[PDB]
Amino acid sequence: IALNKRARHEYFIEEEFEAGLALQGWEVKSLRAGKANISDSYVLLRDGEAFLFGANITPMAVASTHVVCDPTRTRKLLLNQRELDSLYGRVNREGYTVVALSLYWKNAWCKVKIGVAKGKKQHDKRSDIKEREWQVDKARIMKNAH
Amino acid sequence: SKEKFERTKPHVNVGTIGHVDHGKTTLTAAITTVLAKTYGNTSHVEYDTPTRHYAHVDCPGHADYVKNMITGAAQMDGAILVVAATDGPMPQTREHILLGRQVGVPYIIVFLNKCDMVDDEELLELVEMEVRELLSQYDFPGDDTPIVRGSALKALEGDAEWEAKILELAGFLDSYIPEPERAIDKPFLLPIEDVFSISGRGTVVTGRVERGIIKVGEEVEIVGIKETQKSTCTGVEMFRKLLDEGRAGENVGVLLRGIKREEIERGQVLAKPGTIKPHTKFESEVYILSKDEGGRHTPFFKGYRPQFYFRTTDVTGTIELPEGVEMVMPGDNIKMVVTLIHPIAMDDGLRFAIREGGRTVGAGVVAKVLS
Amino acid sequence: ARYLGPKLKLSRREGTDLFLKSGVRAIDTKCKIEQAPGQHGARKPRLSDYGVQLREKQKVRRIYGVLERQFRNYYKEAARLKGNTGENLLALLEGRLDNVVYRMGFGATRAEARQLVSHKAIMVNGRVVNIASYQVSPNDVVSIREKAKKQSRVKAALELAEQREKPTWLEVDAGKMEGTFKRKPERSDLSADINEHLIVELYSK
RNA sequence: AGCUAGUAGGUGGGGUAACGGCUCACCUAGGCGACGAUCCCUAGCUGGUCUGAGAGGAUGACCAGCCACACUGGAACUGAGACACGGUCCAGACUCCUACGGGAGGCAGCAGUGGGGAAUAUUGCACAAUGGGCGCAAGCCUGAUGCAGCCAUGCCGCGUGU
RNA sequence: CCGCAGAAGAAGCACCGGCUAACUCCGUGCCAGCAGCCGCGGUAAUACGGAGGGUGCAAGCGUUAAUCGGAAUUACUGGGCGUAAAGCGCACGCAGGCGGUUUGUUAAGUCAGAUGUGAAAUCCCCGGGCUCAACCUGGGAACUGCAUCUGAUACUGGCAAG
RNA sequence: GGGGCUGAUUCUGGAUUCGACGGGAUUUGCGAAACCCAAGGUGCAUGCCGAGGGGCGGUUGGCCUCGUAAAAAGCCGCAAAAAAUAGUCGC
Ligand SMILES: C/C=C\C=C\[C@@H]1O[C@](O)([C@H](CC)C(=O)NC/C=C\C=C(/C)[C@@H](OC)[C@@H](C)[C@@H]2O[C@H](/C=C/C=C/C=C(\C)C(=O)c3c(O)cc[nH]c3=O)[C@H](O)[C@@H]2O)[C@H](O)[C@H](O)C1(C)C
Ligand SMILES: Nc1nc2c(ncn2[C@@H]2O[C@H](COP(=O)(O)OP(=O)(O)O)[C@@H](O)[C@H]2O)c(=O)[nH]1
Ligand SMILES: [Mg+2]
Ligand SMILES: [Mg+2]
Ligand SMILES: [Mg+2]
Ligand SMILES: [Mg+2]
Ligand SMILES: [Mg+2]
Ligand SMILES: [Mg+2]
Ligand SMILES: [Mg+2]
Ligand SMILES: [Mg+2]
Ligand SMILES: [Mg+2]
């Protein structure tokens, strides 16, 4: 189902729809089988209706033994005109960040099940920052040694 | 490796690329037997004519073997069109003559088998006139070419008339093929075409010396696909005979030390050190015509992926053109930049062949190198 | 492989009277030399330990022109010998032929002395040598061959030699370009700008 | 955790260049073993080398002494000196040649080739010096040896400049 | 070795947050990515990629493979067993280990002296020659071992007395 | 060097791929580049030059310029007597 265990354990998905994406023959024919790496896809704002970002291509042996197929290749999300400016505004002033979740199939199209997830806050690093400050203070206070 | 070869009667290469199952192997075997009697896959037999020493290459006439046949004909200095006089010209023969003209074989001699299988004196003349007309229309020489009729398998049967006929055939072959030009001016260079592994001896690489000489004990450099390395030659030989130096223009086998059969493949060149460097992209001018020079008809566009055949082998390549040409429609006398996957040691002025779908599209001459 | 490259930056990295270039062209604290004032100039992070010892080893090596491996070989020989390891090491460093030429004055700089020794501008006991690592024994004489006499190279070096003080063990005449090396130096005569037991501690580590 | 009955010993013969169950016939029923017998796995040993202040630990690269081996195994002869490293016989595998009547072979020697590997050499020159064996001796030969080639594989020194 | 034109023909690698010698910027933004550990990297990375600049070695620099050291972390020199790992559930007892006090006698353990020996090679010390060195070589010591001859009788032990 | 073989989905006998790429039928809610005239006035006007001219020093008969008679002036600037940054901040 490609549940995206990261987005499951953190910031439960809230909104999603069904759409495909554009890709070349190199990074295709393996999503039909199912192999992929779509864990925490970092989809950000793109002028072309938020082109798909973050998720890489499956490491299946379709390589020409130079690269897998494409270390970085353009991936396009699909939306007529509904979420370019609205997505920009939501990311700016709401806290909801759209990420790709799963890869469902119409038996032909590898659908981008992008989910609009909430930006969850980082863990309290207010102990390790002080630990690092004490470490650098210890490294600096070694002056009076001859 | 037990005969000390004498560099007399300069080596000349003659190749039979005649019709399939029309007696090419039988003809070359008969020629060798009659010459060795009266004088005392690519099959490379040899024979010493009183005029010049010739190496006869029986090439495969099959269409699917055209890739190695390209080197066999580029290797070749004189072509022998071996065809049956009872069937006349064939599509395979036309393809072979087109390939020979595209690779640049100057001198061609036509031989008509099954002379005695026809009890007439007009059909042989009719088929000879037909093949002569074909040559004259396909940009080949004409009435100044020795045309040879006769049986190719009875030349080995006990006779005298056909033996004299085939001796006369060898005579004008050596007459019509004069002393060829050799290019021993620049440092040594030899493109590889075949690899053998001699037990107790090592790895040997076969090919026609493009330029320069090779003395026994000389250092040479392997330059080619994915690899540029160094090595040492020990025991220059030719047709299982002892040699001292290897001139340019003859097919010889050079013994290399510290060579792996799987590591060294066909396509590379044994050059003198510091002479040539492999490249993957280079600029070249193309010479395609409008429609009647192999090139396609429809106006194709960029992204074309043809095979760029070279002295040794070929590789799929991509072409990019400067601005000012929206389309790359046939009729391309312009210059463009060709990028290849496998690097091959190349120099300016190199002539390569552009092919696709089993047919030649156009020619190209290397103009500059972009590495 | 003698060191080659910048020298003022090399000296200001540590900050000492290591030695300078033979020619002088405004050698002073004009604006920024070793303790650069103005808007910056952090000179010493003040490292706790083993750092000053590493700096001492490096400054010793760059002054004498010796490499790390040869310097460690000299240290091992000094430790194997009797006496004090530091003074034995300094004795070997001074007995290196290039420093002998430099302290005799025929070498304007230590690098220049090494260059001359390599180019055979020096001879020992009436025999040429082209090794800057040769060790001279006491009561010996080292001469300059007739070919090196005509060098503005050497003329400037001998001119600059007499502006400094003179050592306890070298007596050199420039009328024949010859110097007698009588005894071996000690820590008392050697410049007291470095500590030897810290270096001993470092490579004994 | 038991092993061994030619096994422990003696009496005589034979055998060995010499002692001796080495072997034979008889008799005695012992011998070895908890300090590890018997059996299994691994392993060339030593002078030495590395790491260590030391006792210790690892290992046997180069070289030297000794042992064993020469496709696997068995056996004997010549020869003072072998169960023989470029002597002989035979069983087995492999390879090669044959005229298909029948024969040859064992690079763990110098090189060199195929395979393995992270990975390692030229099918050189010379008896010029030492040594080796043969010979009145000059003199023969020696892949021992010495020199040559490649590799920065390790140590040392010099140089790219003042 | 002598002459010949000209520096003219000859420098790279690793690292730069603490261990450890070395600081700034740009971009990505638990992503891409570094690493031996501590541990980094969630818009401001001296730690990631690049750039600038510094440091450590240098025709050699880093990763990996194996031994020892630090590991007193198999500890005899030189650990511990109530709660961290560790006193058998308890008792008897053989082989085994040790053993109260005094005398005599044995020389076994132990100690001393002397001899031969510990191959050469190698470590080390004093010197010498290769431009010093690497390397080679002379002499010396050492190789703490082993066996033999004679003494010592305090201690452990054999024997005889209490 | 050649032969066989795998290069999606039931060898797809159709996907607007709702959004990607040159641009487009259809009506227009648009002005010259989506689509022409100059239907309100306005001649100092449709429309052309071999060409000749500034404040210290040069000039691309001109990116300045004339209704082309030969004149009213732009672009570079610090080198000299110039406004040289009165030579090097004697600025
Ligand atoms: C053929 C592939 C391999 C060749 C290898 C290389 O070719 C070459 O690079 C070569 C460069 C000259 C090359 O690229 N050849 C490879 C590629 C290019 C082809 C070359 C030459 C041509 O010119 C455009 C060549 C045919 C040319 O046509 C002229 C006359 C036309 C003949 C008729 C046939 C043709 C075509 C034709 O379409 C035709 C027709 O019109 C009527 C009926 N039926 C036909 O079928 C004349 O005969 C010239 O010879 C060099 O020869 C090298 O030495 C090489 C051997 C390494
Ligand atoms: N009757 C006849 N047969 C011929 C003659 N020349 C060749 N052949 C036949 O050609 C055959 C040899 O063909 P081959 O050379 O092996 O085929 P290729 O290598 O493709 O040309 C033989 O079996 C002959 O029977 C001829 O002059 N007369
Ligand atoms: Mg007996
Ligand atoms: Mg073994
Ligand atoms: Mg043999
Ligand atoms: Mg220890
Ligand atoms: Mg220990
Ligand atoms: Mg403990
Ligand atoms: Mg416990
Ligand atoms: Mg208890
Ligand atoms: Mg219990």
* First-to-final CA distance of chain C: 27
Q: Are B331 and B305 in contact (CB under 8 A)?
A: no
* Three-class SS of chain B: CCCECCCCCCCEEEEECCCCCCCHHHHHHHHHHHHHHHCCCCEEEEEECCCCEEEEEECCCCHHHHHHHHHHHHHCCEEEEEEECCCCCCHHHHHHHHHHHHHCCCEEEEEEECCCCCCCCCHHHHHHHHHHHHHHHCCCCCCCCCEEECCCCCCCCCCCHHHHHHHHHHHHHHHHCCCCCCCCCCCCEEECCEEEEECCCEEEEEEECCECCEECCCEEEEEECCEEEEEEECCCECCCCECCEECCCCEEEEEEECCCCCCCCCCCEEECCCCCCEEEEEEEEECCCCCCCCCCCCCCCCCCCCEEECCCCCCEEEEECCCCCCCCCCCCCCEEEEEEEEEEECCCCCEEEEEECCEEEEEEEEEEECC
Q: Is C62 a member of any domain?
A: yes
| Per-residue tokens: C125 | 């006991």
Residue with token string 């200095």: B77
Residue C195: closest CA among chain A residues belongs to which residue? Answer: A146
Is B131 in contact with B82 (CB distance < 8 Å)?
A: no
Whether residues C71 and C125 fall in one domain = no
CA distance B364 to B349: 9
In words, the CATH class of domain B183-277 is mainly beta
Q: What are phi and psi of B355, to 5 degrees?
A: -135, 155
Q: How far is C65 from chain A (nearest CA, A)?
A: 27
C89 and C102 fall within a common domain:
no
Residues C106 and C131 in one domain: yes
Number of domains in chain C: 2
Chain B touches chain C, with at least 3 Cβ pairs below 8 Å, answer: no
| Gap between the terminal Cα atoms of chain A | 65
Q: How far apart are CA B140 and CA B138, in angstroms?
A: 6
**Do residues B236 and B252 touch, judged by C-beta distance below 8 A?**
yes
Q: What is the CATH number of the domain that holds C23?
A: 1.10.1050.10
Rounded CA separation C74/C90 (Å):
9
| Ligand 1 mean position, distance from CA B180 (Å) | 22
> CB B247: neighbour CB atoms within 10 A?
19
d(CA B122, CA B118): 10
Which of C24, C178, C170, C20 lies closest to C110, judged by CA? C20
Do C78 and C134 have their domain in common? no
Distance, CA of C55 to C1' of E99, in Å: 66
- What determination technique applies here? cryo-EM
Query: Which residues fall within 8 angstroms of residue A125, CB to CB, at 6 or more apart?
Result: none
**What is B278-370's CATH number, 2.60.40.420, 2.60.120.260, 2.60.40.10, 2.40.30.10?**
2.40.30.10
Where do the structural domains in chain B lie, given as residue ranges? 8-180, 183-277, 278-370
Those nucleotides of strand D lying less than 7 Å from any protein Cβ are 107, 112-115, 122-123, 155-162
Strand E atom within 7 Å of C141 CB: no
In a domain, C113, yes or no: yes
Q: Which of C140, C142, C154 minimizes the C-alpha distance to C184?
A: C140
Residue A7: strand, helix, or coil: helix
Does C127 lie in the same domain as C56? no
Would you say the C-beta of A19 is within 7 Å of strand F?
Answer: yes
Instruction: Please check if B25 is assigned to a binding site.
Output: yes
Give yes or no on whether B183-277 and B278-370 have one common fold. Answer: yes
**Do residues B189 and B208 make contact, with C-beta atoms less than 8 angstroms apart?**
no
Resolution (A): 3.2
* B123-137 vs B91-103: helix crossing angle, rounded to 10: 40
Instruction: Report chain C residues whose CB lies below 8 A from the CB of A138.
Output: none
A145: closest chain C residue by CA: C48
Listing DSSP states for chain C in one string gives ----S-SHHHHHHH-S-S---SS-SS-S-SS-SSS--SS---------SSHHHHHHHHHHHHHHT--HHHHHHHHHHHHHSSS-HHHHHHHHHHHBHHHHHHHHTS-SSHHHHHHHHHTT--EESS-B---TTPBPPTTEEEE--GGGGG-HHHHHHHHHHTTS---SSEEEETTTTEEEE-S---TTTS--SS-HHHHHHHHH-
Give the end-to-end CA distance of chain B in Å, rounded to a whole number. Answer: 41
Tokens at B18, concatenated: 């005649």
Region for residue A133 given its phi and psi (left: phi exceeds 0; alpha: psi -120 to 50; beta: otherwise): alpha
C146 and C119: one domain? yes
Cβ contacts of C52 on chain A, cutoff 8 Å: 146
User: Is residue C123 in some structural domain?
Assistant: yes
Q: Are A101 and A113 spatial neighbours (Cβ–Cβ below 8 Å)?
A: yes
Pair C84, C30 in one domain: yes
Question: Is residue C100 one of the residues assigned to a domain?
Answer: yes
Q: Which region, left, alpha or beta, applies to residue C158 given φ > 0 means left and ψ of -120 to 50 means alpha?
A: alpha
Q: Over the Cα atoms of chain C, what is R_g?
A: 18
Q: 10 Å Cβ neighbour count for A137?
A: 9
* Positions of B marked active-site: 21, 24-25, 62
Q: Is residue C1 part of a domain?
A: no
As a whole number of angstroms, the distance between CA B300 and CA B286 comes to: 15
Contact (CB, 8 A) for B362 and B285: no
Please name which of B185, B189, B263, B188 lies closest in space to residue B226, comparing C-alpha atoms: B263
For residue C89, tell me if it sits in a domain: yes
B257 CA to D115 C1' in angstroms comes to 18
DSSP H helices, A4-127, are: 5-9, 84-93
Main-chain phi, psi angles of B208, to 5 degrees:
-90, 125
The Cα-based distances of C173 to C98, C137, C177, C179, C205 in angstroms read: 18, 19, 6, 6, 45
Q: Looking at residue C101, which CATH number applies to its domain?
A: 3.10.290.10
Taking CB atoms and an 8 Å cutoff, what residues of chain C touch A142? 46-48
Superfamily of domain B8-180: P-loop containing nucleotide triphosphate hydrolases (3.40.50.300)
Domain housing C167: 94-181
Distance CA(C126)–CA(C24), nearest Å, equals: 34
C-beta of residue B270 within 8 angstroms of C-beta of residue B190? yes
Task: Say whether both C129 and C70 belong to one domain.
Answer: no
What's the token pair of residue B332?
Answer: 């391309």
Q: Say if C and A touch: at least 3 Cβ pairs within 8 Å.
A: yes
Which residues does a chain break follow in chain C (C to N more than 2.5 Å)? none
> What residues contact B217, with CB distance under 8 A and at least 6 apart?
B232, B233, B234
The alpha carbon of residue B332 and the mean position of all alpha carbons in its chain are separated, in whole angstroms, by 27
Q: Running DSSP on this structure, what letter comes out for residue A37?
A: B
Q: Determine the distance separating the centroid of ligand 6 and the alpha carbon of C22, expressed in angstroms.
A: 51
Q: Could you give the angle at the alpha carbon of B149 between the alpha carbons of B143 and B153, nearest 5°?
A: 155
Relative to beta strand B78-84, strand B107-113 is parallel
Local structure of residue A56 (DSSP, 8 states): B
C77 and C13 in a common domain: yes
Q: Residue B264 and residue B325: Cα distance in Å, rounded?
A: 40
- Neighbour tally for B196: CB within 10 Å: 13
Q: Domain check: are C29 and C81 in the same one? A: yes
**How many Å apart are C30 CA and F88 C1'?**
20
Two tokens, residue A93: 């002033």
User: What SS3 class is residue A89?
Assistant: helix
